[PDB]
Design a binder for these strands. Sequence first.
DNA 1: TGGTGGTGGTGGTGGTGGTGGTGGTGG
Length: 325
Amino acid sequence: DENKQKALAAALGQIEKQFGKGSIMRLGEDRSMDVETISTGSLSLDIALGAGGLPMGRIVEIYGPESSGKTTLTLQVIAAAQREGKTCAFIDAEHALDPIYARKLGVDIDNLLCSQPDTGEQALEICDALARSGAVDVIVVDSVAALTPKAEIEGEIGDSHMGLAARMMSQAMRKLAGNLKQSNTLLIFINQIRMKIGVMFGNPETTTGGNALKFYASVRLDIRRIGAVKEGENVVGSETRVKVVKNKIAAPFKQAEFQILYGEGINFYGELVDLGVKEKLIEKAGAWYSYKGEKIGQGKANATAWLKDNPETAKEIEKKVRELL
DNA sequence: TGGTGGTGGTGGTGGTGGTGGTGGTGG
Ligand SMILES: Nc1ncnc2c1ncn2[C@@H]1O[C@H](COP(=O)(O)OP(=O)(O)OP(O)(O)=S)[C@@H](O)[C@H]1O
Ligand SMILES: [Mg+2]
């Protein structure tokens, strides 16, 4: 009755007096709580994510074995970010970026902030400082397996430092979660894989840096290499596979496959033809691919060349599949 | 055969009671 209304009013008034405006409000009328996303550059993955892109303000996680293609996909993301007009930062903790290849993929070197730190504490301080400013929209840490605590860099090569990196990461998560969301900035951790001894059942694969990062993420993705793409005998690229092993903004466990060629990277148009054929928009007959009663190409490669050479029909195919899916 | 009329402050004593746990790594 009226008593409850008065009690709620007084409580909310006191709260918002003590801690400021916006502290307590109904959920439906708050626009800060909405989810928004940006593209990963691959249609298959951007549909597997469900919401069409990676979430802004959150923490994403990517890991795989050696030569799986992590930095490549992250550079594609950063590329799409600038192309829409958004600043970016790239923290290379492993000291292994090569500016040229980045230029090849599409990132504007004149605008991509960069840093090669020497200790994990310095890296995460830089992350906090950049995020808190409201000036950097995308941040990337090249490998969480290289963020060494201070005490171990100055120690001997046999000094055990049990569990220090886990403590570092657990503190860092607590600190960042709030500022990332306040500023609307996306942070991507990239991780490696180490096997575990003593497992009696199940897989032995694990990632580095403790259990903290797993709880705090909204998205986690596997990435694996599954085959080679050949031109004649000459190897030209790699075939991949991805699983959304964790999700918090859409139904999880879907997949995505695509080609990485050593040139531009993600073969957008191969993916588009595959989607068109799968959703039955592009016609096919035996080994011959067709379109609206006209024969397109007698193979994947030639058909893709056809699509690339034919901007007029490619955009129709695109928008149709996009709107359908 | 007959009584008058009030002055002026001085010096401090004594101590109580502690609260709380972080973080795995390598075939
Ligand atoms: N500058 C380059 N030029 C040509 N091919 C490259 C170049 N850099 C990477 N590649 C290829 O892309 C694949 C490796 O992708 P990466 O970006 O290194 O992802 P990664 O899984 O982190 O591998 P790491 O960092 O060496 S463990 C390999 O097929 C490389 O041959
Ligand atoms: Mg890399």
